[PDB]
Scaffold this active site. Structure first.
Site, PDB file in Angstrom:
ATOM      1  N   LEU E  41       0.923  -1.155   0.034  1.00 59.06           N
ATOM      2  CA  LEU E  41       0.127   0.058   0.118  1.00 59.06           C
ATOM      3  C   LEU E  41       1.006   1.205  -0.036  1.00 59.06           C
ATOM      4  CD1 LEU E  41      -1.519   0.799   3.355  1.00 59.06           C
ATOM      5  CD2 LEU E  41      -0.245  -1.108   3.227  1.00 59.06           C
ATOM      6  N   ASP E  42       0.188   2.405  -0.353  1.00 55.53           N
ATOM      7  CA  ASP E  42       0.977   3.457  -0.877  1.00 55.53           C
ATOM      8  C   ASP E  42       1.297   4.305   0.464  1.00 55.53           C
ATOM      9  OD1 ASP E  42       1.017   3.046  -3.626  1.00 55.53           O
ATOM     10  OD2 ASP E  42      -0.657   4.098  -3.877  1.00 55.53           O
ATOM     11  N   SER E  43       2.221   5.461   0.229  1.00 59.72           N
ATOM     12  CA  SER E  43       2.321   6.229   1.393  1.00 59.72           C
ATOM     13  C   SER E  43       1.119   7.267   1.553  1.00 59.72           C
ATOM     14  CB  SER E  43       3.509   7.319   0.993  1.00 59.72           C
ATOM     15  OG  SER E  43       2.992   8.188  -0.029  1.00 59.72           O
ATOM     16  N   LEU E  44       0.357   7.295   0.808  1.00 58.94           N
ATOM     17  CA  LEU E  44      -1.241   7.959   1.135  1.00 58.94           C
ATOM     18  C   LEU E  44      -1.847   7.188   1.985  1.00 58.94           C
ATOM     19  CD1 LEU E  44      -4.300   8.832   0.016  1.00 58.94           C
ATOM     20  CD2 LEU E  44      -2.297  10.740   0.325  1.00 58.94           C
ATOM     21  N   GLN E  46      -0.679   5.054   3.924  1.00 62.14           N
ATOM     22  CA  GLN E  46       0.178   4.997   5.200  1.00 62.14           C
ATOM     23  C   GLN E  46      -0.145   6.098   5.998  1.00 62.14           C
ATOM     24  OE1 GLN E  46       3.016   5.438   8.003  1.00 62.14           O
ATOM     25  NE2 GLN E  46       3.323   6.655   6.204  1.00 62.14           N
TER      26      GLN E  46
END
Ligand SMILES: CCCCCCCCCCCCCCCCCC(=O)OC[C@H](COP(=O)([O-])OCC(O)COP(=O)([O-])OC[C@@H](COC(=O)CCCCCCCCCCCCCCCCC)OC(=O)CCCCCCCCCCCCCCCCC)OC(=O)CCCCCCCCCCCCCCCCC
Ligand SMILES: CCCCCCCCCCCCCCCCCC(=O)OC[C@H](COP(=O)(O)OCCN)OC(=O)CCCCCCCCCCCCCCCCC
Ligand SMILES: CCCCCCCCCCCCCCCCCC(=O)OC[C@H](COP(=O)(O)OCCN)OC(=O)CCCCCCCCCCCCCCCCC
Lengths: 96, 176, 606, 157, 87, 459, 128
Positions: E41-44, E46
């Site tokens: 999953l992405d940083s966003l 996260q």
């Protein structure tokens, strides 16, 4: 980015140190310290009442211009307790 | 303005804009579920142009996003009552007495607390024991004449504790 | 009567024993909160009796002794009076503050500096009693600055938290503005009427009355949170919760207007003065009404509400009606002390987060406190006909049948609507919405202290308004002859405000996310007054005080005028006289010109 | 202890020497050092800073003096005592400043003008005078027990 | 006012409210799981996760930390820094 | 009075032939015995002043200042170690004997019949404090401090000598009764204006007024605690008492010629309350506080109401007590940390837990907490000046607001909020400092109980 | 949308719309990195002079002493008497003084002339 291995390792050694510190910081000798070695109502409704009621007879009867009243109101349908006489009653009512 | 680097990055700036927009929209929007709807709308509006290869277009739309967010902020955001600025700002700072004190007591009170002060004596011996040589060797050892950073490496060599540990280990419990 | 003076003085002196007790204690008696609570309860139950004798007969008496510095044609002793105001107000304050003693036992349980707290709170109680008893105006000034500085200490109770000491500095500065107004009034009273007393001033009503009445206005706006001097109020909410409850329930919040109720024969005349009274009160009332909307703290909302009620009392003094204002003091005191206490119970129940966001719905989270808060926020604007009916509705009716300044009537009307709508909104957003709060509840009220204090003040907010409003001597003419659509319009405006905030809640149920129309911003940023004045007036005095005062005018110019010219002149004359090269011919030529300049130019032998 | 050349008399000239000395002495970058300059107002050669610095410096950096905003080596701008929190909030205001003062002064002027229009225009119900019977309550005013008999009476209407 | 927080219980609470989130499984998820590498999953998202932890526990985390948590164990370590989770 | 003078002479060789580790107890004990002996002075009654034969007398104005002085001496004599308790035996005896000789000339100055005797003992009061603050000033500009001190005070105080010899040789001798009982009103010449300017300007130097106020602050911040407390309390209120003596002459001209001094005093009171709101160097804030209160005193002296004189003497004695205490607290804080600044050593609410109560009580008697003597003085000065003019009350209350502001800013700046946690050396409070605190604030509150003593001759 | 936030000497300029952060050059990166290096060396010297168990007294910051010596005794040197400083001193020092002296002249003239006419309210005006 993420943690560097420097951050990981340094932060884990401070985990061990801080957790040992707070593990110590609970005091427990199973005894924390050790020592070297109606009447309320009675006193607080009798003693200052007696002291002040002494203070409000004799020193007030020394000093003349002291505690003074604002006068009890008398009515036409009343009398005077002291000598004994009535004020004559209030007059006629009409056009109610 | 950060201990690790000199600047954050573009991605961190877009990231903090996401976080602050999400927080201020929490403060703006009650009932939490129309809030959840509008937060998904904000996630979609960031998913409009995630796929930009250009860089001046990225920072230009980031600047315009800052403009749009500053037009749509809230005067009293829901700052948490733990954080400074909120309702705490070290609320229980009355009893945050540091530990360079508690040794300036009379030995009667030190006789009242024998075991804790003996363990404090062994902690003080642990501080004094390898303070001088190993910490001066590791701090004079690793950097170049320009330090250029504000972290420090752990004691990875052989033995004892990582250097400069005392006032970070010893601190108030934050609920005294 | 000896019993009357004796019991009043022992009610004063029961508020003397715990302070000297834990000054002379030297052994840490851990039941000291219990000690303070039971002596305050004993002080109240002794204070009810001479008031009962007062309403039974009358006999309005003053006491005065132990004179000191009877110097010129005045004298001044320790002197205080038992009349209607100074006898009716005291048991209400003792009863309210005793409930605050219970709630401060519970709410401040887990801090081990509780003894200093209760010492300060009882000392503040003593000082506010000294304020409300005295007739000699020097003792009024004593009580004034004493309650100001005990207010300072209890706001800055939490050392740390720069909010608190900044806020307390704001409070003490507005208190000194109250001081300059009050000493202007004191100076006029001394120089024109040979004293500063109720009795002689009311004995000789003067003609010129601009200056002392303006001093009374300045003291009233210095103490009672009025417009231009109000914004120390969320400031004062930044302290502890029972501190704020005592500080803005009865004590310290009425002392600006209690002085104006005191000087009612002086403000019988001077129509200009009463015009200033009612216009300034209507300005305060409208600004607190418009400012109290769109607010997030509970304490800031309840504080803006009590400031609005202070504005209504200034309107009540604008009309020739002192006694209705005093009855409103008492009922308001009971009412919002109960409300602050219940709100602080809620705040401690949810981990001291205190914001209305993340508090959304807590009805059936025990309905004791929700019942208490709705008895409050419904008894505001006067459920007909309860304690809140009597004072507020007789105030607005007497204002309606008076010589109103043609805008203040609409001010009271719109402010009554606004206090209705934020009462309704604080009910809905606190207890009647979707329940928002963090997980892991700790909602506990297994507590005799909480139920006793909340119980006894809801009993007070049900009966004591009618008990006060029955047995007082009517010192005014009741109007009693009002038209159609004038007596009805108060409850009409409150009901339409209830419907107005209800449809505000129904639009809040929707989802559109509109934009702020900047009346939003004017209402939410406190009318822009605290931000503008607190970023402007600290900047001017300290921009000048560094550049002109410290660096420029005093130091460098005063050192260039008095030392520098003198010292430089001495250095130049020294280095031109005694710095001569060591020859002979120049010295004898100097002797020659001395002989010539003595003989022929400026003569000596002629 | 303290070096004699860690005082700071004399201004900025010349541009190599005293600027390099201020870089060495004030613990700053060379071009970040700027004197005010000396317009004759004293000031030594003490640096210019970004002047707000206290509602700035967001508190999650966790520097060494949290309520003082020090870093033990910062040059400590000349108006420090006017800047610490408890004195002046140098925050970015969420709206404006001139637009705020125009709104506020317009509001105060509008309310005082409605007060003045009220002061020239009173309100009154259909209500006559209160009939004080005994010569507008004579003999209980501030004198005249025998001086001026002033006959005036009301009529039953 | 402070209920007794232990390490393993607050770890279970963090992993529980992660498990209540939809687009990751309860199946291939443990304490030594990553937020960028294995789940992907992405940083966003996260930071959506970090906002969920903040909104549960009631305190923010600084943005000097915001990049570099990436696993539940170090989240538990930072919350143990904040609350001093012991007797 | 000579029975109140000669044991101070006999107290001088006490310090010399007291041996080592013994001078301290003997000096403190016998100076407290002198404090009882001077507490036995108060006999003055009714019609006249009290004559202590021909050389001496006392009004009821010199009496409270004299009792204040001899009470303040043991407080100082215990205050003045821990910065010279490790110095030499002979120099220590010299220091203590110089303090005793200084007290002797203080009592000589307060108890004067003739103004020539007053002037000789005035600059005799001047000379030892010079030596004390210059020798133990403990900062690099104590030289400049003592130099400005002696030059301002002599260069202002010098035409007073010529004017007093003139009044000696034109109108008989200089008894205060015979300066009284005989003084004709001297009309408005220009020579009368110069003589009035000489006398009043000499004491203006000693107060100080606003135009000559930079005399003070170097001579406080670059001076030890003994010379600081003697300087502030006894020297400034001594100058005030001197003007209270000499203002009996020249009444028909002070009305026309006393307008600008009131002016400079008022505007300097305002600007001095403004200047001590922002400064560092904690010791100096109390010095400018003293400048503000003495400008208020000078307004009170140059208007000539009995209300003004009663408020004047109350403000004198109360501010002497308050300033001496608050200097002792700043000394205690500097002995804790060797900085003298303000923003550095914050905190101190956790540590030193009852020292905060003394900071609080000192700052509230500096705040004019209303039963205290300080508000009695300030209040009657405000009453008399509103009788003098109808518009000066704005400046008085503006002083009041800013005075409360800087005093309470001093309270919540240094001792409120956060220890900087690099200090890590200060030890908790000694019994000596708290003993000095209880020496300070018990007489102030006891005078607040019974204040009919300290009000002036126009009681 | 928004009026782009005019600044003032009170309204601080926030970190978002600088806009000069977005003009990234090697000059600004080198300046920020060397600024980080300066604060790094200062914090390292502080932590070496801060954490020692033998160090009793205060940290003895030379920057604070430098600020105090600049603020207290570095006022009068250096200085030159210019036109601007002289005009500002005479505008702030004798101006308001002669203002309040003129208004005291005015109030005292009014009071003197009125009580010389005798039309004052001194039926009882005792406490003068
Ligand atoms: C000779 C006769 C007097 C003898 C007094 C002996 C000492 C008494 C004692 O031990 O008191 C305990 C108390 C110390 O309590 P603690 O438990 O050791 O620690 C408390 C903390 O340090 C915190 O200190 P604190 O909170 O106690 O300090 C607060 C301070 C604040 O001062 C005030 O509040 C004064 C203004 C009150 C309003 C006036 C109207 O004092 C008071 O509240 C006293 C009020 C009465 C003073 C005026 C009479 O002593 C003091 O505070 C020192 C003396 C204060 C002045 C007393 C004057 C009496 C006359
Ligand atoms: C109305 C009252 C007005 C009062 C005015 C008093 C006179 C002016 C101030 C006198 C004190 C001046 C002073 O002390 O200046 C300091 C200066 C020495 O300073 P500095 O350069 O540091 O020297 C140290 C050794 N090299 O010292 C000098 O330069 C001394 C120069 C001689 C000064 C003698 C005192 C004044 C005499 C006036 C006569 C007319
Ligand atoms: C009449 C003469 C009045 C002179 C006032 C001088 C004030 C100087 C001291 C300023 C000061 O200490 O400011 C501290 C405080 C900071 O306010 P702020 O930081 O905005 O607090 C809100 C939440 N932190 O700011 C304040 O307390 C502001 C100052 C008090 C209010 C000033 C405006 C009302 C009075 C106007 C004049 C009448």
């Amino acid at each position: 980015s993420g943690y560097t291995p420097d951050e990981k390792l340094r932060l884990q050694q401070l985990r061990e140190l801080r957790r040992r510190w707070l593990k110590d910081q609970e005091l427990s000798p199973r005894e924390p310290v050790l020592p070297p070695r109606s009447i309320f109502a009675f006193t607080h409704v009798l003693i200052p009442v007696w002291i002040i009621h002494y203070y409000l007879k004799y020193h007030v009867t020394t000093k003349p211009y002291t505690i003074v009243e604002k006068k009890p109101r008398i009515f036409p349908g009343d009398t005077i307790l002291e000598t004994g006489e009535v004020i004559p009653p209030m007059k006629e009512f009409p056009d109610q | 303005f950060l201990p690790s680097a000199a600047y954050l990055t573009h991605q961190q700036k877009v990231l903090q804009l996401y976080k602050r927009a999400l927080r201020h929209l929490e403060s703006r929007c009650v009932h939490r579920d129309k809030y959840r709807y509008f937060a998904c709308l904000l996630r979609a509006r960031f998913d409009e142009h995630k796929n930009e290869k250009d860089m001046v277009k990225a920072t230009q739309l980031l600047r315009e996003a800052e403009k749009e967010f500053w037009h749509g902020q809230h005067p009293q955001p829901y700052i948490f009552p733990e954080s400074p600025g909120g309702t705490s700002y070290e609320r229980y700072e009355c009893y945050k007495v540091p530990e360079w004190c508690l040794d300036d007591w009379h030995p009667s009170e030190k006789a009242m607390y024998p075991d804790y002060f003996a363990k404090r004596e062994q902690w003080k011996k642990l501080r004094r024991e390898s303070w001088e040589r190993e910490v001066k060797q590791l701090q004079e050892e690793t950097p170049v004449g320009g330090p250029r950073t504000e972290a420090l490496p752990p004691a990875r060599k052989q033995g004892d504790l990582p250097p400069l540990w005392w006032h970070i280990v010893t601190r108030p419990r934050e609920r005294p | 009567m000896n019993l009357f003076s004796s019991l009043t003085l022992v009610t004063l002196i029961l508020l003397t024993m715990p302070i000297a007790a834990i000054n002379f204690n030297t052994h840490k008696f851990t039941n000291y909160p219990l000690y303070v609570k039971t002596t305050i309860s004993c002080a109240f139950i002794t204070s009810m009796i001479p008031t009962m004798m007062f309403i039974h007969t009358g006999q309005e008496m003053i006491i005065s002794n132990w004179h000191w510095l009877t110097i010129q044609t005045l004298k001044l002793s320790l002197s205080f009076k038992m009349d209607f105001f100074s006898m009716m107000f005291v048991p209400v304050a003792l009863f309210v503050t005793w409930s605050i003693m219970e709630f401060s036992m519970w709410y401040m349980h887990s801090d081990p500096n509780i003894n200093q707290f209760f010492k300060y709170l009882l000392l503040f109680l003593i000082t506010m009693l000294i304020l409300v008893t005295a007739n000699n105006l020097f003792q009024l000034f004593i009580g004034w600055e004493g309650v100001g500085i005990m207010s300072f200490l209890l706001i800055g109770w939490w050392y740390g938290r720069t909010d608190a000491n900044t806020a307390a500095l704001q409070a003490i500065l507005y208190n000194r503005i109250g001081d300059i107004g009050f000493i202007l009034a004191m100076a006029w009273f001394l120089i024109n009427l040979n004293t500063w007393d109720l009795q002689q001033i009311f004995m000789l009503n003067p003609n010129d009355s601009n200056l002392p009445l303006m001093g009374l206005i300045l003291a009233a706006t210095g103490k009672s949170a009025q417009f231009g001097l109000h914004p120390w109020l969320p400031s004062a909410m930044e302290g502890p919760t029972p501190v704020s409850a005592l500080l803005h329930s009865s004590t310290m919040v009425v002392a600006g207007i209690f002085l104006l109720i005191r000087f009612y024969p002086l403000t019988e005349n001077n129509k200009f003065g009463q015009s200033i009274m009612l216009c300034l009160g209507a300005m305060t009332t409208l600004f607190t009404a418009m400012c109290a909307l769109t607010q997030n703290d509970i304490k800031k909302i309840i504080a803006f509400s009590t400031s609005s009620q202070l504005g209504l009392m200034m309107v009540t003094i604008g009309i020739n009606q002192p006694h209705l204002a005093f009855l409103h003091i008492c009922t308001h005191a009971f009412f919002k002390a109960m409300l602050f206490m219940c709100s602080g119970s809620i705040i401690h129940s949810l981990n001291d987060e205190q914001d209305i966001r993340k508090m959304g719905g807590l009805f059936k989270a025990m309905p004791f406190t929700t019942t208490a808060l709705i008895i409050g926020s419904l008894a505001l604007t006067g459920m007909p006909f309860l304690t809140g009916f009597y004072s507020k509705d007789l105030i607005i009716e007497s204002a309606n049948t008076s010589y109103t300044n043609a805008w203040a009537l609409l001010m009271t009307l719109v402010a009554t609507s606004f206090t209705a709508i934020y009462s309704t909104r604080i009910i809905f957003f606190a207890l009647l919405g979707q329940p928002r709060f963090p997980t892991l509840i700790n909602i506990n009220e297994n507590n005799p202290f909480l139920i006793n204090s909340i119980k006894r003040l809801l009993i007070g907010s049900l009966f004591a308004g009618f008990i006060i409003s029955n047995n007082i001597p009517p010192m005014t003419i009741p109007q009693m002859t009002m038209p159609h659509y004038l007596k009805m319009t108060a409850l009409t405006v409150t009901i339409l405000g209830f419907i107005l905030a209800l449809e505000i809640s129904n639009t809040t149920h929707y989802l559109k996310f509109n934009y702020p129309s900047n009346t939003f911003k004017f209402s939410n940023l406190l009318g822009y007054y605290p931000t503008i004045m607190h970023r402007l007036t600290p900047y001017m005095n300290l921009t000048m005080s560094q550049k002109s005062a410290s660096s420029l005018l005093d130091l460098i110019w005063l050192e260039t005028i008095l030392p520098k010219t003198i010292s430089l002149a001495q250095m130049k004359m020294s280095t031109t006289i005694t710095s001569q090269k060591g020859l002979i011919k120049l010295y004898f030529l100097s002797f020659l010109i001395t002989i010539l300049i003595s003989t022929t130019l400026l003569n000596f032998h002629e | 202890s303290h070096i004699t050349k860690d005082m700071l008399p004399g201004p900025y000239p010349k541009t190599p020497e005293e600027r390099a000395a201020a870089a060495k002495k004030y613990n700053m970058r060379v071009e970040d050092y700027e004197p005010y300059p000396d317009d004759g107002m004293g000031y030594g050669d003490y640096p210019k800073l970004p002047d707000r610095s206290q509602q700035e410096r967001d508190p999650w950096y966790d520097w060494d003096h949290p309520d003082l905003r020090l870093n033990w080596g910062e040059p400590m701008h000349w108006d420090l005592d006017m800047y610490i929190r408890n004195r002046v909030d140098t925050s970015p205001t969420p709206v404006n400043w001139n637009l705020m003062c125009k709104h506020l002064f317009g509001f105060v002027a509008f309310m005082l003008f409605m007060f003045w229009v009220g002061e020239t225009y009173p309100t009154y119900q259909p209500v006559g005078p209160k009939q004080y019977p005994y010569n507008n309550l004579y003999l209980e005013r501030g004198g005249d027990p025998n001086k001026e008999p002033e006959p005036v009476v009301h009529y039953e209407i | 006012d402070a209920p007794p927080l232990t390490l393993e219980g607050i770890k279970d609470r963090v992993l529980y409210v992660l498990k209540l989130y939809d687009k990751i499984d309860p199946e291939k998820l443990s304490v030594n799981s990553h937020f960028m590498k294995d789940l992907g999953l992405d940083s966003l998202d996260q930071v959506e996760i970090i906002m969920a932890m903040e909104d549960e526990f009631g305190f923010e985390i600084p943005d000097i930390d915001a990049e570099k948590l990436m696993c539940p164990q170090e989240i538990v370590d930072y919350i143990a820094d904040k609350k001093d989770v012991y007797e | 009075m000579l029975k109140y003078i000669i044991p101070t002479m006999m107290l001088m060789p006490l310090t010399w032939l007291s041996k080592n580790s013994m001078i301290w107890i003997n000096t403190t004990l016998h100076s407290l015995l002198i404090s009882l002996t001077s507490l036995l002075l108060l006999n003055q009654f009714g019609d006249n002043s009290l004559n202590f034969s021909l050389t001496f007398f006392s009004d009821s104005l010199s009496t409270p200042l004299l009792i204040l002085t001899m009470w303040l001496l043991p407080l100082m004599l215990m205050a003045s170690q821990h910065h010279l308790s490790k110095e030499n035996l002979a120099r220590k005896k010299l220091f203590i004997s110089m303090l005793i000789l200084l007290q002797l000339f203080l009592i000589m100055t307060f108890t004067a019949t003739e103004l020539i005797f007053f002037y000789i003992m005035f600059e005799a009061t001047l000379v030892p404090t010079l030596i004390i603050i210059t020798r133990w000033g403990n900062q690099t500009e104590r030289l400049n401090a003592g130099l400005y001190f002696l030059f301002y005070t002599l260069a202002g105080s010098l035409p007073l000598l010529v004017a007093l010899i003139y009044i000696q040789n034109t109108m008989g001798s200089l008894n205060f009764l015979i300066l009284q009982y005989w003084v004709q009103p001297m009309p408005n010449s220009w020579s009368n204006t110069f003589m009035w300017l000489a006398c009043m300007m000499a004491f203006m130097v000693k107060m100080p007024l606003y135009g000559l106020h930079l005399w003070l602050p170097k001579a406080h911040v670059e001076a030890p605690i003994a010379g600081s407390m003697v300087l502030a309390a006894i020297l400034l209120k001594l100058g005030g008492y001197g003007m209270m003596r000499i203002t009996l002459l020249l009444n028909p001209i002070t009305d026309f010629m006393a307008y600008p001094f009131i002016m400079l005093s008022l505007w300097g009171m305002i600007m001095t309350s403004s200047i001590c709101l922002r400064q560092t160097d904690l010791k100096s804030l109390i010095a400018y506080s003293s400048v503000s209160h003495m400008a208020l005193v000078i307004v009170a002296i140059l208007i000539q109401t009995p209300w003004s004189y009663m408020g004047a003497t109350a403000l004198m004695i109360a501010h002497g007590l308050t300033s001496s205490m608050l200097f002792c607290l700043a000394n205690s804080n500097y002995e804790r940390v060797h900085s003298r600044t303000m923003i550095l050593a914050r905190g101190l609410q956790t540590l030193l837990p009852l020292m905060a109560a003394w900071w609080l009580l000192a700052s509230l008697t500096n705040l004019a907490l209303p039963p205290s003597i300080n508000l009695i003085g300030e209040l009657f000065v405000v009453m008399s000046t509103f009788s003098w003019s109808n518009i000066t009350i704005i400046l008085m209350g503006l002083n009041m607001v800013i005075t409360a502001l800087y005093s309470l800013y001093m309270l919540i700046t240094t001792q409120r909020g956060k220890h900087t946690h690099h200090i890590n050396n200060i030890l908790p409070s000694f019994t000596r400092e708290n003993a000095l605190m209880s020496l300070h604030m018990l007489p102030l509150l006891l005078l607040s109980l019974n204040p009919k003593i300290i009000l002036g001759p126009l009681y | 949308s928004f009026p782009k936030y005019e600044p003032s000497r009170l309204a601080s300029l926030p970190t978002t719309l600088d806009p000069a952060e977005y003009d990234i050059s090697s000059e600004t990166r080198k300046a920020q990195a060397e600024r980080l290096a300066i604060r790094s060396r200062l914090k390292r010297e502080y932590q070496l002079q801060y954490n020692d168990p033998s160090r009793r007294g205060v940290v003895e910051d030379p920057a604070l002493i430098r600020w105090t010596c600049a603020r207290s005794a570095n006022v009068y040197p250096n200085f030159r008497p210019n036109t601007k400083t002289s005009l500002l001193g005479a505008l702030f020092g004798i101006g308001p003084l002669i203002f309040w002296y003129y208004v005291f002249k005015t109030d005292r003239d009014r009071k003197e002339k009125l009580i010389q006419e005798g039309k004052l309210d001194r039926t009882f005006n005792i406490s003068y």
